[PDB]
Amino acid sequence: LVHVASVEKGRSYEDFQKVYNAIALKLREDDEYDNYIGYGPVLVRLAWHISGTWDKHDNTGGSYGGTYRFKKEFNDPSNAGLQNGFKFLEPIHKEFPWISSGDLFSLGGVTAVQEMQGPKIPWRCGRVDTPEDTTPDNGRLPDADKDAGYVRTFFQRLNMNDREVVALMGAHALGKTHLKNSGYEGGGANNVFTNEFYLNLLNEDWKLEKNDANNEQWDSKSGYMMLPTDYSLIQDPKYLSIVKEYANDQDKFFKDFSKAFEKLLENGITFPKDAPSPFIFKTLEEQGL
Numbered sequence: 154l155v156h157v158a159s160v161e162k163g164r165s166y167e168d169f170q171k172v173y174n175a176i177a178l179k180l181r182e183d184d185e186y187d188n189y190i191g192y193g194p195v196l197v198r199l200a201w202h203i204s205g206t207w208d209k210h211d212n213t214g215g216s217y218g219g220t221y222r223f224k225k226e227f228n229d230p231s232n233a234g235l236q237n238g239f240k241f242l243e244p245i246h247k248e249f250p251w252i253s254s255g256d257l258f259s260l261g262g263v264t265a266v267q268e269m270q271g272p273k274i275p276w277r278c279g280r281v282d283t284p285e286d287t288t289p290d291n292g293r294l295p296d297a298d299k300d301a302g303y304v305r306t307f308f309q310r311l312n313m314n315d316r317e318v319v320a321l322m323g324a325h326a327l328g329k330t331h332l333k334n335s336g337y338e339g340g341g342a343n344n345v346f347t348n349e350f351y352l353n354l355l356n357e358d359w360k361l362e363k364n365d366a367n368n369e370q371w372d373s374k375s376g377y378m379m380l381p382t383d384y385s386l387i388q389d390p391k392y393l394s395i396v397k398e399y400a401n402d403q404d405k406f407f408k409d410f411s412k413a414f415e416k417l418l419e420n421g422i423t424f425p426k427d428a429p430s431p432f433i434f435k436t437l438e439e440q441g442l
């Protein structure tokens with residue numbers, strides 16, 4: 154099963170920079186969402202959940218086909234809450250209906266990371282909408298109640314190694330959990346992309362507790378929280394070394410996250426040899442907008 158990137162007809166960098174800018178301006182405008190977190194974090198999670206259905210063994214799932222737009226995937230319990238991100242992107246799509254759904258969902262994540270002061274994430278176009286019968290079944294996204302061995306095995310299906318896993322998980326500095334979405338609560342919140350996930354893991358005083366949905370989570374005195382799968386990154390000695398590395402080197406974290414996030418968003422896609430190079434979008438700040 155081969156998915157060949159096909160550039161939206163006649164489009165180039167500046168067309169996509171316009172879509173980026175529209176997303177970024179809306180991120181700035183709709184600032185009240187989720188008690189003033191804004192839509193950045195939910196857009197990052199959306200880009201990850203549309204990509205994280207991929208299976209390296211048969212090239213099913215992944216961002217290419219834009220299949221989150223279909224009911225089976227939209228209503229995956231694992232995707233509870235992401236409808237907010239989809240609704241945010243709807244007017245963007247209406248303004249730029251030439252862009253494929255997969256390209257828009259993935260571009261939303263890249264824009265959110267960058268606008269939240271994260272690393273630049275090179276991005277490639279050419280995902281093509283595929284039909285409803287190509288939508289992956291529910292159940293391909295990871296459970297949060299598990300341990301390091303589960304996390305390591307899970308991410309092998311996405312062709313991610315220990316460094317890539319630990320880097321990607323740094324996105325859990327962003328946003329918050331919501332009991333009605335996932336059965337986890339708390340931690341306060343954040344909309345600036347930093348390496349704080351790793352600092353919090355190493356420096357806070359953590360206590361395992363059972364929340365009001367009867368799920369276990371790690372809570373700190375200062376009010377932060379970690380999922381069991383987050384905490385597993387300091388329980389496993391291989392993951393712990395990498396946590397320490399990123400806690401001590403912001404730039405290294407940014408570089409590794411950028412590579413892993415681009416990889417995640419591109420898994421399953423064959424780029425022709427004459428395809429355009431990856432685009433690196435300017436932030437609104439860099440453009441004076």
Ligand code: HEM
Binds near residue numbers: 201328
């Ligand atoms: C073992 C892997 C992972 C597990 C079990 C997991 C689980 C979760 C859970 C349970 C939530 C809370 C959802 C809610 O209640 O609204 C969440 C939020 C979030 N996740 Fe993960 N996740 C994983 C990996 C990732 C990755 C790889 C990324 C992206 C690089 C990511 C990005 C986010 C973001 C940004 C949020 C906050 C969303 C918001 O504020 O609305 N997650 N995750």
Ligand SMILES: Cc1c[nH]c(-c2ccccc2)n1
Binds near residue numbers: 325328339378
């Ligand atoms: C699983 C997840 C996503 N976001 C967070 C979080 C962010 C800031 C503080 C505490 C938790 N956890």
